[PDB]
Ligand binder design. Structure first.
Ligand SMILES: *[C@@H]1O[C@H](CO)[C@@H](O[C@@H]2O[C@H](CO)[C@@H](O[C@H]3O[C@H](CO)[C@@H](O)[C@H](O)[C@@H]3O)[C@H](O)[C@H]2NC(C)=O)[C@H](O)[C@H]1NC(C)=O
Ligand SMILES: *[C@@H]1O[C@H](CO)[C@@H](O[C@@H]2O[C@H](CO)[C@@H](O)[C@H](O)[C@H]2NC(C)=O)[C@H](O)[C@H]1NC(C)=O
Ligand SMILES: *[C@@H]1O[C@H](CO)[C@@H](O)[C@H](O)[C@H]1NC(C)=O
Ligand SMILES: *[C@@H]1O[C@H](CO)[C@@H](O)[C@H](O)[C@H]1NC(C)=O
Ligand SMILES: *[C@@H]1O[C@H](CO)[C@@H](O)[C@H](O)[C@H]1NC(C)=O
Ligand SMILES: *[C@@H]1O[C@H](CO)[C@@H](O)[C@H](O)[C@H]1NC(C)=O
Ligand SMILES: *[C@@H]1O[C@H](CO)[C@@H](O)[C@H](O)[C@H]1NC(C)=O
Ligand SMILES: *[C@@H]1O[C@H](CO)[C@@H](O)[C@H](O)[C@H]1NC(C)=O
Ligand SMILES: *[C@@H]1O[C@H](CO)[C@@H](O)[C@H](O)[C@H]1NC(C)=O
Length: 871
């Protein structure tokens, strides 16, 4: 069953056969950054197991021109092979003239060439702007999951590990980096230089990497002698300082924490200009977006600092979770991505406790629950096959839900027993691969009535959705049922092994009960006012207090809120508003709970609460529901006047202090509070008049620019300043500010530039569209554009890239009318070209219907509740 030139093709599965295992790759690459193409050769030391007529391996968009097979027994230098190509599985078959012999080592050699990548995949070209306005080319790799094969032919599944010796030829004006450090640089006849790189460790193909560029570094050494260097564009070297400092502290932490040294002499962190993902964990050569790594204190803010620290810690943790211990197959991608996200917490809490990152980790878990509460959610670990359905595994479920469900398990086993379990996991499967079950046996065993942790996690990993815990308190006995939590019912299948954590009014001691059933009972050792299940919200479930249970907790908040823990509070605020969407509580209960927030000073809770009230304002503003929006404006500005007026247009104070400032000054300026608009307007006007000279504090930088962008003069100068900027973070904030214009031609212009890709890089287009679509003046525009340019979009990105998923989601999911639901339905059916299908078509439809339902069921309550206040 087969093509191309002619005949049958030996192997039919899209997975490779087990029979021939690579041990080592010699790989020579000769890129040309004027021609924008490359020539290359490799030699794959392979080991046969079963006898065979055909070697099979991956290759894509590669012209193969010579293919020889040598041996050491057998047939010494050396015989030629025939190449069959089968693009539909991205495979090529090497036909041999002789049934190869078991247990012997051969050498597969091919010459191959291709144009440098045109997109964000395989070995591609990126560009950057010099301070002088020069444009400069570099070449870079991104192979995850399956684009190693676009750069050199190989056994491109992450189970087929091997050693890699890379050689790279280059002009004198460039450097070459790769996974390993550079052993030597030999000069050649014609003036060109060639760099030789230490042979790698055993590793998967998706992590192999190499770059050619004219970047400058800053370097440092960890206590363990590792040479960390931070590579970036030449005129951006000042911005590499924080990343160096942090990575140093972080690698020290990770080394000790895991009790496993980082194996390589060096670890490079490079800031690539055209970079689709946030970062990529390429062993010893970690590639990052400039916003994931660079930092300029004149222009990056607290949040940016927190983000850069977070991604650095994420990618450094990958060096152990992923690279050192790789998953067997892409179905279990979370073992890498989830653990890496979890370790951000542990590592950043340890190295940078001033950042208060653990309060922010709750945020990330809650934002998961929001998407995980629909029918069309999926498990963190489900099977995967085709080139599309592997790319579908890359999102936030396999990632954040992963990290939260791990964070739960830390709490249930304690930091010390959890740590010891992953130390053994890492050591037991070092330089090797591991399944889901291999992790659980490692965490249970660390005699003997059993931790049977497998059973507990089978239900959190391989099963969809999230539990709701309902509790009734009749005097001194507690009723406990569990249900699947959905966002529209009145579920017939599911059941979790959910550890529980309750506290009471009587004492603040944490008692623990587990559970492995639909129903259960537990009596408390006291009569008491309230119970609060899920302490600090370290579990990944939602609590509903049926009977008077909710009302007690709200009267507790209004009386003396500090008798609940500050994380206990954010949990309750969250849960209440979600249960309104569930139809288990009524909106007035939720809105009444927001009264205490004029006394709340824990910014976690205060920001959470405000986010719901701001969320409602924006729902109302996008629909033209003026009477409610104008009331909700007025409520937010009068209630919360004290805390708004207490805010300095400054960079002063803690991290949460600075984030609260940015939030509240944004809210005030988004709701047209004349004092905040006039201050912002002054700061911008002084700035533009001085021509970049004055300094807007970084925490009000978005606010000042966005207000400034309402005048035509300001918008045009901001777009100009965008192109000249040397901070990708300032640029980010400028792009937001530009996308808050009311002028339709201006919003379109931004989209057109983002298509064009020269001034506003294409990597920013999805976020840009979503920025526009969020607002009432651009929600239609953005929608029209995405439909009318679907073909035009799908040249620039493949579906289902993260980029395409966020273009669909970001232009549609905020809709909340029956009309627009139909428009989206229509458009989604229309895409039964190859288009249909993606999982995100369903989840958008369910998201829009959720908004339809929420409005019909709760809007008149929101209207009256606001009118009750005004009296
Ligand atoms: C990728 O392709 C480039 C051309 O597109 C090539 O640049 C060229 O390099 C040669 C020397 O290496 C220059 O020619 C020189 O040599 C001849 C004698 O053989 C002399 O007649 C000339 O005076 C000169 O000394 C070309 O001038 C040069 N082209 C330019 C404009 O720079 C790159 O070297 C290739 N890159 C790699 C790394 O493969
Ligand atoms: C491929 O990588 C492996 C490690 O994954 C290398 O094996 C190391 O070899 C040295 C010298 O024999 C030993 O001291 C180490 O114990 C090995 N590493 C570990 C930690 O197991 C091997 O050198 C590489 N192979 C090639 C072809 O160079
Ligand atoms: C190779 O050998 C073993 C027998 O030892 C067999 O089980 C395995 O299937 C063989 N590989 C194939 C697919 O021919
Ligand atoms: C394949 O191309 C190489 C280029 O290095 C050449 O030396 C060789 O002669 C070619 N193969 C054969 C069998 O001629
Ligand atoms: C950063 O500033 C220092 C001193 O002010 C200067 O020497 C250097 O050129 C600057 N670096 C960059 C990349 O702008
Ligand atoms: C946060 O960090 C400190 C150590 O710096 C520790 O006392 C505390 O237990 C940590 N919490 C978590 C979630 O690890
Ligand atoms: C959830 O919703 C619809 C209708 O109830 C159902 O057909 C669908 O299969 C469910 N979601 C998925 C993708 O399982
Ligand atoms: C709230 O309760 C705390 C703890 O007893 C107490 O210190 C404080 O004075 C109380 N304040 C109010 C507002 O009742
Ligand atoms: C939307 O806003 C416009 C401008 O204020 C207003 O004229 C119109 O009444 C609103 N649309 C509807 C149908 O309410």
């Amino acid at each position: 069953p087969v093509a191309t030139n002619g005949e049958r093709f030996p192997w039919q599965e899209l997975r490779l056969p087990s029979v021939v295992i690579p041990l080592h790759y010699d790989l020579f690459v000769h890129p040309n950054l004027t021609s924008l193409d490359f020539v290359a050769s490799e030699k794959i030391e392979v080991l046969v197991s079963n006898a065979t007529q055909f070697i099979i391996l991956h290759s894509k968009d590669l012209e193969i021109t010579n293919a020889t097979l040598q041996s050491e027994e057998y047939m010494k230098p050396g015989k030629e092979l025939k190449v069959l190509s089968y693009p539909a599985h991205e495979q090529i078959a090497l036909l041999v003239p002789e049934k190869l012999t078991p247990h012997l080592k051969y050498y597969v050699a091919m010459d191959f060439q291709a144009k440098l990548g045109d997109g964000f995949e395989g070995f591609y070209k990126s560009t950057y702007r010099t301070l002088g306005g020069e444009t400069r080319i570099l070449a870079v790799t991104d192979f995850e999951p399956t684009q190693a094969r676009m750069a050199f032919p190989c056994f491109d599944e992450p189970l087929f590990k091997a050693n890699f010796s890379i050689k790279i030829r280059r002009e004198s004006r460039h450097i070459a980096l790769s996974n390993m450090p550079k052993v030597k640089t030999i000069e050649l006849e014609g003036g060109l230089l060639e760099d030789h790189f230490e042979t790698t460790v055993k590793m998967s193909t998706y992590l192999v990497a190499y770059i050619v560029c004219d970047f400058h570094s800053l370097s440092g050494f960890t206590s363990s002698g590792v040479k960390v260097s931070i590579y970036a564009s030449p005129d951006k070297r000042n911005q590499t300082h924080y990343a160096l400092q942090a990575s140093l502290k972080l690698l020290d932490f990770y080394e000790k924490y895991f009790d496993i040294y980082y194996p390589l002499s060096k670890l490079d962190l490079i800031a690539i200009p055209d970079f689709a993902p946030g970062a990529m964990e390429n062993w010893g050569l970690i590639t990052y977006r400039e916003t994931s790594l660079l930092f300029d204190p004149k222009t990056s803010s607290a949040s940016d600092k927190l983000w850069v620290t977070r991604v650095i810690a994420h990618e450094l943790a990958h060096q152990w979770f992923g690279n050192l211990v790789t998953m067997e197959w892409w179905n279990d991608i979370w073992l890498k991505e989830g653990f890496a996200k979890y370790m951000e917490l542990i590592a950043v809490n340890a190295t940078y406790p001033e950042l208060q990152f653990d309060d922010y980790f709750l945020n990330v878990c809650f934002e998961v629950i929001t998407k995980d509460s629909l029918n069309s959610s999926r498990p963190i670990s489900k099977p995967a096959e085709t080139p599309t359905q592997i790319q579908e595994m890359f999102d936030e479920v396999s990632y954040n839900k992963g990290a939260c469900i791990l964070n739960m398990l830390k709490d249930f086993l304690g930091e010390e027993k959890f740590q010891k379990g992953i130390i053994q996991y890492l050591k037991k499967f070092s330089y090797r691969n591991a399944k889901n079950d291999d992790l659980w046996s490692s965490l249970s065993n660390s005699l003997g009535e059993n931790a049977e942790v497998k059973e507990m996690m089978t239900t959190w990993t391989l099963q969809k959705g999230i539990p709701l815990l309902v509790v009734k308190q009749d005097g001194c006995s507690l009723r406990l049922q569990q249900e699947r939590f959905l966002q529209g019912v009145f579920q017939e299948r599911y059941l979790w092994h959910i550890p529980l954590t309750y506290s009471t009014s009587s004492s603040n001691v944490i008692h623990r009960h587990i559970l492995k059933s639909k129903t259960d009972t537990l009596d408390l050792p006291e009569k008491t006012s309230w119970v609060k299940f899920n302490v600090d919200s370290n579990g990944y479930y939602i609590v509903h207090y049926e009977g008077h249970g909710w009302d007690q907790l709200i009267t507790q908040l209004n009386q003396n809120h500090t008798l609940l823990r500050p994380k206990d509070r954010v949990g309750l605020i969250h849960d209440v508003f979600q249960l309104v969407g569930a139809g288990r509580l009524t909106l007035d209960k939720a809105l009444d709970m927001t009264y205490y927030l004029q006394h709340e000073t824990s910014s976690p809770a205060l920001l959470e609460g405000l986010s719901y009230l701001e969320s409602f304002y924006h729902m109302m503003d996008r629909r033209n529901i003026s009477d409610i929006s104008e009331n909700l404006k007025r409520y937010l500005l009068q209630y919360f006047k004290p805390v708004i007026d207490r805010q300095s247009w400054s960079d002063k104070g803690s991290v949460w202090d600075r984030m609260l400032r940015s939030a509240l000054l944004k809210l005030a300026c988004d709701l047209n509070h004349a004092p905040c608009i006039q201050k912002a307007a002054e700061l911008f006007s002084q700035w533009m008049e001085s021509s970049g000279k004055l300094n807007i504090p970084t925490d009000v930088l978005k606010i000042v620019y966005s207000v400034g962008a309402q005048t035509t003069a300001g918008w045009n100068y901001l777009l100009e300043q965008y192109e000249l900027s040397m901070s990708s973070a300032e640029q980010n904030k400028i792009l937001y500010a530009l996308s808050t214009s009311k002028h339709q031609e201006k919003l379109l212009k931004l989209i057109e530039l983002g298509m064009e890709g020269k001034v506003i890089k294409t990597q920013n287009l999805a976020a840009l569209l979503h920025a526009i679509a969020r607002r009432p003046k651009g929600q239609q525009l953005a929608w029209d554009f995405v439909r009318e340019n679907w073909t035009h979009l799908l040249k620039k990105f493949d579906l289902g890239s993260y980029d395409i998923r966020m273009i669909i989601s970001g232009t549609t999911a905020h809709f909340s009318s029956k009309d627009k639901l139909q428009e989206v339905k229509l458009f989604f059916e229309s895409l039964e070209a190859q288009g249909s299908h993606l999982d995100i078509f369903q989840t958008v439809l369910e998201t829009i219907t959720k908004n339809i339902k929420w409005l019909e069921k709760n809007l008149p309550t929101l209207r009256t509740w606001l009118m009750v206040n005004t009296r």
